[PDB]
Ligand binder design. Structure first.
Ligand code: NAG
Ligand code: NAG
Ligand code: NAG
Ligand code: NAG
Lengths: 112, 280, 198, 123, 50
């Protein structure tokens, strides 16, 4: 199944400032069949299973963390973080559901 | 396959005289002390009808598909009431919608349900005595393949049971017609006791009932009652007895008639207009 | 019935009506096509069928001949030229359940429309992409049926509405499902017009 | 209120089997697949499988098949996952996860995951 | 569509030749006199073409 290398291991963002998380992946998440990607980002919360970050490798979740934004194509996952609140300490995930079985990503942690 | 019956390579048909029976009322109309003429499918006078019989007593029986050649006449004296109705249709199978008339002991019962009538169809009665008086067995008039459009249930035409002969007490006599989607039936129950000969004299059948139908009825056969006991000619279907079941069948021809009505308004005289120039 | 598996119960040789629609079970909501309801004390039909089911209530706009809203077109496409009338009344108090009566189903989709009076209870995962679907349950193929969400919290359009679409027809076989003829007193000696049953 | 609340505590030392459950609230149970996910002290998020509750259909990750099955009761609006055997290190914060049916035709955006779920430290 | 073109949909009976019934009577399409309430069974008497 698709391997999903996340980089860095730890986003060392001293807060306020913008940032990016990246996850290179081996294999396809372009939905050139139906348009868009089958690709989302997810962030595991301190004590709670993940809130969705971003639909379709670009458009934001209904939770409005507009401090975050995204882009990519094919097998680029780019997470870009326009602002950091001190609560953004957390573990950020790329994942695949373009095929079944699923896989979860390697996680990236957040800290100063 | 339904289990084959026995003793059924027939002998030739008994050509016989109508004696002009089978007059019947054509309409709803009260008429009296008056004469009137009409035309219909009728049993013609002195028609060469035929006599038919489950003559097991000899040692033979019969009731395969007879053609409903666009109208049928029936007569039988009661003589232990072996007949328990008739079935109709054309294909007489579960591949066209098809009609049952049965004189069950519970009821006269009618259904139109695309019956898989058995090639060896009957209603059974058997001495296995699931009640103290022997009265029933497995039916196998049909195998149960069905698609349904009609039922009707009516008082039984029930008299006592045995698969053997009986007395001439009443003539149950009937005529069957489809008026292009109206299967109309006529009856009478005339008391007569005599030898085999269908009676001379006069009467007319009244219009027993009608069912609106769609089926293109072209073929039919009688429900014989078949009675099972351990002397009868085998097990199950091969177990049967049926007396002689002597009866008559004939056909209804389009013919003009003159009719007469008394002060009571009964039919009381009739003429087949094609027998003889005098009659004509 | 669930509309995906809609009943087609025949009615036969008995007195038809619409006056009963104004007594102990008067319709909430109702429509006719091609015929005025007033004639249903007069006309007679060879066959009549209760095409009986429940809907999501908004389908009152969908369940029409010629109207081609897909759920109907996958569950019961009425004949697009049919002439007749339909029960479709609200049943929220009845069919909605507190936890939710998630047992009334509709086909979400099929490879084609239904034809008039067609019923399809193919239940394999519907193909929408390539290769035999074999339980893939979400990419090339999807399971084609879904329940309605019938609960008291449902907004009125989402609420259940109980349906009998009334198919009725005439054939070479004579009509017998007939509306009640009226009756009048046995006046005598006066000169009158009459109809004694014809 | 929309929620999906798990079975409470399970705690035992290894080798017995287990059944874990999660009951919906608010939403039409057939309006979502339930999926089941678990924590790992390494990777964290790990996916086991999905129930199409309305069909009852299931699919499963290669790691788990022989032990695992999962099932539902739609009339009880409640989902089940069942495992032949728990190790000590199969102790995890197990999640019931919520997954909407294809309100979007072609369903890709329908296959965003409501991974809010709820976690439970089945042990 | 041109929903400005209309027809009387309902009447108590057919017209006579060259009548022109422009009367906006709420059609009692059932029981109860409708009294202008224009409820169910109480319909605005014209309808548009598409
Ligand atoms: C009378 O009918 C019988 C039986 O159908 C037939 O065998 C016979 O030839 C007929 N004869 C005539 C001419 O009456
Ligand atoms: C008769 O029944 C069979 C099986 O239910 C069905 O396939 C067939 O269409 C039916 N025919 C009719 C119209 O009664
Ligand atoms: C015919 O009418 C006469 C005179 O009333 C009556 O005596 C006779 O019994 C009637 N017969 C029938 C068939 O009613
Ligand atoms: C039929 O249902 C109606 C509700 O529309 C109810 O008022 C009526 O009493 C019911 N009648 C019976 C006895 O089923």
């Amino acid at each position: 199944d698709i391997q999903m290398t996340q980089s860095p291991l730890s986003l060392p963002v001293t807060p306020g400032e913008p940032a990016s998380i990246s996850c290179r992946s081996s294999q396809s998440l372009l939905d050139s069949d139906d348009g868009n990607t089958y690709l989302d980002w997810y962030l595991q919360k301190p004590g709670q299973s993940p809130q969705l970050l971003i639909y379709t490798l670009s458009y934001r979740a209904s939770g409005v963390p507009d401090r975050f934004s995204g882009s990519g194509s094919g097998t680029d996952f780019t997470l870009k973080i326009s602002r950091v609140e001190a609560e953004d300490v957390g573990v950020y995930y790329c994942m695949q559901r373009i095929e079944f079985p699923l896989t979860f990503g390697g996680g990236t942690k957040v800290e100063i | 396959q339904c289990v084959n019956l026995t003793t059924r390579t027939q002998l030739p048909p008994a050509y016989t005289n109508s004696f002009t029976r089978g007059v019947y009322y054509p309409d709803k109309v009260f008429r009296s002390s008056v004469l009137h003429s009409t035309q219909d499918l009728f049993l013609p006078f002195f028609s060469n009808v035929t006599w038919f019989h489950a003559i097991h007593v000899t040692k033979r029986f019969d009731n395969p598909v007879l053609p409903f050649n666009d109208g049928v006449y029936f007569a039988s004296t009661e003589k232990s009431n072996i007949i328990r109705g008739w079935i109709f249709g054309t294909t007489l199978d579960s591949k066209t919608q098809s009609l049952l008339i049965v004189n069950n002991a519970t009821n006269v019962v009618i259904k139109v349900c695309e019956f898989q009538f058995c090639n060896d169809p009957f209603l059974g009665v058997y001495y296995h005595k699931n009640n103290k008086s022997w009265m029933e067995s497995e039916f196998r008039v049909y195998s149960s393949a069905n698609n349904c459009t009609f039922e009707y249930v009516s008082q039984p035409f029930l008299m006592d049971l045995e698969g053997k002969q009986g007395n001439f007490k009443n003539l149950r006599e009937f005529v069957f017609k489809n008026i292009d989607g109206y299967f109309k039936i006529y009856s009478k129950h005339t008391p007569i006791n005599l030898v085999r000969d269908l009676p001379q004299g006069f009467s007319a059948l009244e219009p027993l009932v009608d069912l609106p139908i769609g089926i293109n009825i072209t073929r039919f056969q009688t429900l014989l009652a078949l009675h099972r006991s351990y002397l009868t000619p085998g097990d199950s279907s091969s177990g049967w007895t049926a007396g002689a079941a002597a009866y008559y069948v004939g056909y209804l021809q389009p013919r003009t008639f003159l009719l007469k009505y008394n002060e009571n308004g009964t039919i009381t005289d009739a003429v087949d207009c094609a027998l003889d120039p005098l009659s004509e | 019935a669930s509309v995906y598996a809609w009943n087609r119960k025949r009615i036969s040789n008995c007195v038809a009506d619409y006056s009963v629609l104004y007594n102990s079970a008067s319709f909430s909501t109702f429509k006719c096509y091609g015929v005025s309801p007033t004639k249903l004390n007069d006309l007679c039909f060879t066959n009549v069928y209760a095409d009986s089911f429940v809907i999501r209530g908004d389908e009152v706009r969908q369940i029409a001949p010629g109207q081609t809203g897909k759920i109907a077109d996958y569950n019961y496409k009425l004949p697009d030229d049919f002439t007749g009338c339909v029960i479709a009344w609200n049943s929220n108090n009845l069919d909605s359940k507190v936890g939710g009566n998630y047992n009334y189903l509709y086909r979400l989709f099929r490879k084609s429309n239904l034809k008039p009076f067609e019923r399809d209870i193919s239940t394999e995962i519907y193909q929408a992409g390539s290769t035999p679907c074999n339980g893939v349950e979400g990419f090339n193929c999807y399971f084609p049926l879904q329940s309605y969400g019938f609960q008291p919290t449902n907004g009125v359009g989402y609420q259940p509405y109980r349906v009998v679409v009334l198919s009725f027809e005439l054939l070479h076989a004579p009509a017998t499902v007939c509306g009640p003829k009226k009756s009048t007193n046995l006046v005598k000696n006066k000169c009158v017009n009459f109809n004694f049953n014809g | 209120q929309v929620q999906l609340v798990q079975s409470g505590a399970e705690v035992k030392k290894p080798g017995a089997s287990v059944k874990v459950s999660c009951k919906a609230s608010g939403y039409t149970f057939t309006g979502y697949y339930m999926h089941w996910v678990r924590q790992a002290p390494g990777q964290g998020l790990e996916w086991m499988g999905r129930i199409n509750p309305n069909s009852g259909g299931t699919n499963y990750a290669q790691k788990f098949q022989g032990r695992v099955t999962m099932t539902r009761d739609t009339s009880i609006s409640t989902a089940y996952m069942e495992l032949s055997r728990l190790r000590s290190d199969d102790t995890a914060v197990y999640y019931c996860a919520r997954v909407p049916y294809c309100s979007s035709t072609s369903c890709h955006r329908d296959w965003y995951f409501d991974l809010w779920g709820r976690g439970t430290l089945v042990t």
